[PDB]
Amino acid sequence: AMGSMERASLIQKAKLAEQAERYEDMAAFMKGAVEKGEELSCEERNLLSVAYKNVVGGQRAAWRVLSSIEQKSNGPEVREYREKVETELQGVCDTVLGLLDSHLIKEAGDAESRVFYLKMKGDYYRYLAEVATGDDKKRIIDSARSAYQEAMDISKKEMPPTNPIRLGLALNFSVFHYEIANSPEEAISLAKTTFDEAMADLHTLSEDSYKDSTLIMQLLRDNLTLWT
Amino acid sequence: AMGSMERASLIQKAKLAEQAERYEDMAAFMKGAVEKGEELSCEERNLLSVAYKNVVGGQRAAWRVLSSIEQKSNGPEVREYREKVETELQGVCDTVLGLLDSHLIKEAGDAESRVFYLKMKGDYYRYLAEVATGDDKKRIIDSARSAYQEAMDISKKEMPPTNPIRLGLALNFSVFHYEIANSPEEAISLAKTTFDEAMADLHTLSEDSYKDSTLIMQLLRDNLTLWT
Ligand SMILES: O=P(O)(O)Oc1c2c(c(OP(=O)(O)O)c3c1[C@H]1C[C@@H]3c3cc4c(cc31)[C@H]1C[C@@H]4c3ccccc31)[C@H]1C[C@@H]2c2cc3c(cc21)[C@H]1C[C@@H]3c2ccccc21
Ligand SMILES: O=P(O)(O)Oc1c2c(c(OP(=O)(O)O)c3c1[C@H]1C[C@@H]3c3cc4c(cc31)[C@H]1C[C@@H]4c3ccccc31)[C@H]1C[C@@H]2c2cc3c(cc21)[C@H]1C[C@@H]3c2ccccc21
Ligand SMILES: [Cl-]
Ligand SMILES: [Cl-]
C-alpha cells in the first residue's frame, strides 16, 4: 500500500495530515512508517499515537451516540448501523494492537519506550472493552489491566512522578478502573496518589515536561472533582 | 452497495449518521436513497445536501491547508499529498453532479425543487473550480455560473425575497463572484441587493422561514462587512 514510499516521505506526509486534520490518512502513513521495520523515535511514537487516537476517538463518539439511541424502554436499523460502526472501531483497534505486538513492543528497549507502547496496548484493549460483551469481555479487560499494570510497575521504578508518560499512564489506568473495571474505589486512590506524589516531589518537574505534565495534572484533578 | 436495503431504512440510517457525525456514511446512505429512483422530498433534499456539504467541506479545508503549504518562496511530498486529496475532493464532486444530472435535476418539477438542485449544481462546480487550473478551469467556472444563473432567474419569478432557498442561493452566487469569478464589483451588488430587497418586502417573511432566513441575512451582511 505505502511500500513504494521512502520512510522519510511517509513521516513528512504524516506531519502534513495532522495539519490538514486527516487522521485516517495520518494513521495510514504511520502504519506504513512502522512497517519499514525500524524502531520509532520519541516524536514518531507520538505521531503514531495521535493519528490513531483521533481515528478511534471519532468512532467511539459515534458508537456511544448510536448505542445511547438503543433505548429499549417501554425496527432493526439502529442496531445494524451501531454494529457497522462497532465492527469498524474494532478493526482499527485490532490494527494498532498488531503493530504493537509484531513491531513496537520489545523486551529489550528504553524505559520511556517500553512504557509508552504498553500504555497504548492498555488504551486500545480499553476501547475494545467498551464495545465488547459477555464471556468475551472478561478476557479483554484482563489484557488491558495486565498491560497497564506492567507499564505502571516499570514507571514507578524508572520514572519520576512528574513525568508526562508516567502521569498520562496513571490517568488512563484510573479511567480504566472507573469506566471499565467498575471500581471507583481503586480509581480515586490511584488518581489522588498520582496527583499528590507529583506535588510531593515537584522539585523533579523539569523545563521540558512543564507544559505536558501540568495539563495531565489538571485532567487528573478534573476527574476527581467529577468523581468526589 | 446499498441496493439490498429498503429506501426507508437508508433514510432512517442517514438521519442516524448526522447525529453520530458520520458524513462519509450519511452521504453514502443518501446516494443510495437517491438511486432507488424516486423523487426526493424537501427534508430528504436537505439530508442529501448536508451529508455531501460536510464531506466535501472537510476535504476543501484540507486542500486549502496543503495548498497554502506550497510556499515556493525564495521535495515532492507536499504536492503528492495535496494531489491525493485534490483527486479525492473531485471524485466526491463528480459523484454529486452525477446524481444531480442522472436523477434529481428534471425539466418538469416544483420551483422550490428545481432551484435547490441547480444551486447545488453551482455549488459543486464552484468547489471544482477552486482546485482546477488552466483552460480546464474556464469551462468549470461557466457551468457554475450557468447553473447559478438559471437558479436565480427562476427564484426571482417564483419565490419571495425572504425565502431561504432564494436567499442562500444569492449568498452562494455572490461568493462565486468574489472568490471564483474575480469581480468584487458584482459580488457586492448582488449581496446588498439581496439584503435590501429582503428588508424592503419583509412583510413576506413567514413563521416557517423566520429562523433559516434571518441567519442567511446575517451571513449576507457579515460578507459585506468583510468586503466593504
Ligand atoms: O517545552 P515546550 O514543549 O515547547 O512547551 C511549550 C509549548 C508551547 C508554548 O507556548 P508558545 O507558543 O508561546 O511557545 C510554550 C512552551 C514552553 C514555552 C511556552 C511556555 C509557557 C508556559 C510554560 C511552558 C512553556 C509553563 C509556564 C507557561 C505555562 C502555561 C500553562 C502550563 C504550563 C506553563 C506550545 C507548544 C508547547 C505547548 C503545549 C501545550 C499547549 C501549547 C503549547 C496547550 C496544549 C498543551 C498545553 C498545556 C497546558 C496549557 C496549554 C497547553
Ligand atoms: O420553525 P423552526 O424550523 O422550528 O425554527 C426554529 C428552530 C429552533 C428553535 O429553537 P427551539 O429549540 O427553542 O424550539 C425555534 C424555531 C422557531 C421556534 C424557536 C424559535 C425562536 C426564535 C425564532 C423562531 C423560532 C425567531 C425568534 C427567535 C429567533 C432567534 C434567532 C433567529 C430567529 C428567531 C431550533 C430548530 C430550528 C432552528 C434553527 C437554527 C437554530 C436552532 C433551531 C440555530 C441554527 C439555526 C439558527 C438561525 C438563527 C439563530 C440560531 C440558529
Ligand atoms: Cl448499516
Ligand atoms: Cl500522497
From Swiss-Prot, chains A, B:
The modification Phosphoserine is found at residue 9. Ubiquitinated. Ubiquitination by RFFL induces proteasomal degradation and indirectly regulates p53/TP53 activation. InterPro entries: 14-3-3, 14-3-3_CS, 14-3-3_dom_sf, 14-3-3_domain, 14-3-3_sigma. GO terms for molecular function: cadherin binding; identical protein binding; phosphoserine residue binding; protein kinase binding; protein kinase C inhibitor activity; protein sequestering activity. The record marks 60, 126 as: Interaction with phosphoserine on interacting protein. It is found in: Cytoplasm; Nucleus; Secreted. GO terms for biological process: cAMP/PKA signal transduction; establishment of skin barrier; intrinsic apoptotic signaling pathway in response to DNA damage; keratinization; keratinocyte development; keratinocyte proliferation; negative regulation of innate immune response; negative regulation of keratinocyte proliferation. Keywords: Cytoplasm, Nucleus, Phosphoprotein, Secreted, Ubl conjugation. One of its GO terms (cellular component) is extracellular space. Present mainly in tissues enriched in stratified squamous keratinizing epithelium. Its main location: cytoplasm. It comes from the Eukaryota. Belongs to the 14-3-3 family. Homodimer. Interacts with KRT17 and SAMSN1. Found in a complex with XPO7, EIF4A1, ARHGAP1, VPS26A, VPS29 and VPS35. Interacts with GAB2. Interacts with SRPK2. Interacts with COPS6. Interacts with COP1; this interaction leads to proteasomal degradation. Interacts with the 'Thr-369' phosphorylated form of DAPK2. Interacts with PI4KB. Interacts with SLITRK1. Interacts with LRRK2; this interaction is dependent on LRRK2 phosphorylation. Adapter protein implicated in the regulation of a large spectrum of both general and specialized signaling pathways. Binds to a large number of partners, usually by recognition of a phosphoserine or phosphothreonine motif. Binding generally results in the modulation of the activity of the binding partner. Promotes cytosolic retention of GBP1 GTPase by binding to phosphorylated GBP1, thereby inhibiting the innate immune response. Also acts as a TP53/p53-regulated inhibitor of G2/M progression. This is 14-3-3 protein sigma.
